[PDB]
Amino acid sequence: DQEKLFIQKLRQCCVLFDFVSDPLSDLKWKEVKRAALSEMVEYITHNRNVITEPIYPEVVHMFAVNMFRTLPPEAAWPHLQLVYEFFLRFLESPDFQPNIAKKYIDQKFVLQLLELFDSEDPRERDFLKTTLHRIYGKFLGLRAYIRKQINNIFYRFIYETEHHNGIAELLEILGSIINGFALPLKEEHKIFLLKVLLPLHKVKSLSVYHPQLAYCVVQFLEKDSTLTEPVVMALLKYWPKTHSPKEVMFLNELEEILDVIEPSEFVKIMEPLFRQLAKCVSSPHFQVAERALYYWNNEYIMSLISDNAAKILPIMFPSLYRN
Amino acid sequence: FSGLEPIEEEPE
């Protein structure tokens, strides 16, 4: 019976071992366990209807025993990478039924998985990123708990200085959610964009998670072009008043906001924008000015400028125009 | 960084 041997090899991978007086049995045990994982990865990726009901607790148990650990202030990445892979192909499988898995993938599991985002291994955080994205898309009953617990991590990172190596990869997930949001946006989300996503531009380690943060900010305005006024005004607030090469990030974000800005809302914030933008063209840092002047290579911006030339050119070149 | 495909929010 094949279903029995599947469970045997699963439980076999729940035995964590160590040999200090036998460096060869250790290697075999590793190789025996690395091989059993590979065998199961192939078995589940290519065979149809092999995922039966008794399997689910075995898989979640095998994942929890290997992955849910304590992160040192990993080394056996060959093994850890196979586990995430197997668990990933297990979620993606067409034989996967969330109604049965909902029993064993509870909130405690999701919580424990989020602890691992603090890990300092980019390749591990990349597997955790993908894994959490499959859970959200199939476990409707966990979508709320995840948002609440992610909204917690961010709140801890801005205010309580709870540094997190996983901020970048968490934002990347949120963008996948924001892009699929529903008709009127809930106030729960608006608050998050305003009272969480924008204050993220305030933290010092912005250099690491800025591209993904900007994506979420743009995806929010792509849905509801109502929030483009408080977004832009906040960015000019959080704008580094100190002339620094970190302005290039804001110019990037602002040009990315302008490529999707609704012209009816552009005029609502076009004056305070260019006052700052003119300051950038006058910056003592070439990279800042070079970037602000690269705005003109944007055709949709030029149209927005010429259709409002009466207000812009006075600000950009006050020597040459008046009001 | 993109990569991940969107998730159509629908009634929980």
Chain B positions touching A141 (Cβ under 8 A) are: 12
Cα–Cα–Cα angle for A252, A253, A256, nearest 5°?
Answer: 85
Q: Distance (Å, rounded) from C-alpha A288 to C-alpha A282?
A: 9
Q: For chain A, count helices (H), then strands (E).
A: 18, 0
In single-letter form, the type of residue at position A236 comes to L
Q: Which residue has the tokens 């075995």?
A: A58
Cα–Cα–Cα angle for A258, A271, A290, nearest 5°?
Answer: 55
Chain A positions touching B6 (Cβ under 8 A) are: 176-177, 179-180
Q: Measure in Å the smallest separation between the Cα of B12 and chain A Cα atoms.
A: 6
How is chain B split among helix, strand and coil, in percent rounded to 5? 0, 0, 100
- Taking alpha carbons only, the member of A96, A86, A102 closest to residue A39 is A86
Q: Distance (Å, rounded) from C-alpha A17 to C-alpha A276?
A: 61
Which of B1, B8, B12 has its CB closest to that of A212? B1
Cα–Cα–Cα angle for A60, A63, A68, nearest 5°?
Answer: 115
Q: Distance (Å, rounded) from C-alpha A111 to C-alpha A107?
A: 6
- Rounded to whole angstroms, the maximal C-alpha distance in chain B is 28
- Rounded to whole angstroms, the maximal C-alpha distance in chain A is 86
Q: Distance (Å, rounded) from C-alpha A188 to C-alpha A130?
A: 25
How many CA atoms does the CB half-sphere of A24 hold within 13 Å? 0
Which residue does chain A place closest to B9, by CA atoms?
A: A181
Q: Which residues of B touch A (CB under 8 A)?
A: 1-10, 12
Taken in order of first residue, the domains within chain A and their CATH numbers are 1-323 (1.25.10.10)
- Taking alpha carbons only, the member of A33, A6, A38 closest to residue A17 is A33
Q: Measure in Å the smallest separation between the Cα of A128 and chain B Cα atoms.
A: 13
- Taking alpha carbons only, the member of A134, A110, A129, A109 closest to residue A119 is A129
Q: Answer yes or no: do B7 and A180 touch at CB < 8 A.
A: yes
- Taking alpha carbons only, the member of A2, A81, A97 closest to residue A41 is A81
Determine phi and psi for A220, rounding to 5 degrees: -70, -45
Quick one: how far is CA A308 from the chain centroid?
37
Structure tokens at A86: 């197997």
Secondary structure element (H or E) that encloses residue A98, with its range: helix A98-101
**DSSP for A158-205, written as a single string:** HTS----TTHHHHHHHHHHHHTT--SSPPHHHHHHIIIIITGGGGSTT
- Taking alpha carbons only, the member of A149, A201, A198, A156 closest to residue A173 is A149
Structure tokens at A229: 């006024």
Elucidation method: X-ray
Q: Distance (Å, rounded) from C-alpha A102 to C-alpha A140?
A: 10
Q: Distance (Å, rounded) from C-alpha A144 to C-alpha A136?
A: 9
Q: Measure in Å the smallest separation between the Cα of B11 and chain A Cα atoms.
A: 8
Query: At a CB cut-off of 8 Å and minimum separation 6, what does A291 contact?
Result: A247, A248, A251, A252, A280
Which residue does chain A place closest to B2, by CA atoms?
A: A172
CA distances to A53, A144, A166 from A74, rounded to whole Å, are 32, 31, 15
Question: Is residue A56 a contact partner of residue A100, using CB atoms and an 8 Å limit?
Answer: yes
- Taking alpha carbons only, the member of A88, A80, A172, A86 closest to residue A134 is A88
CA distances to A114, A159, A241 from A155, rounded to whole Å, are 15, 6, 24
CA distances to A139, A146, A217, A218, B8 from A114, rounded to whole Å, are 16, 9, 23, 25, 22
Task: Enter the DSSP assignment of A118.
Answer: G
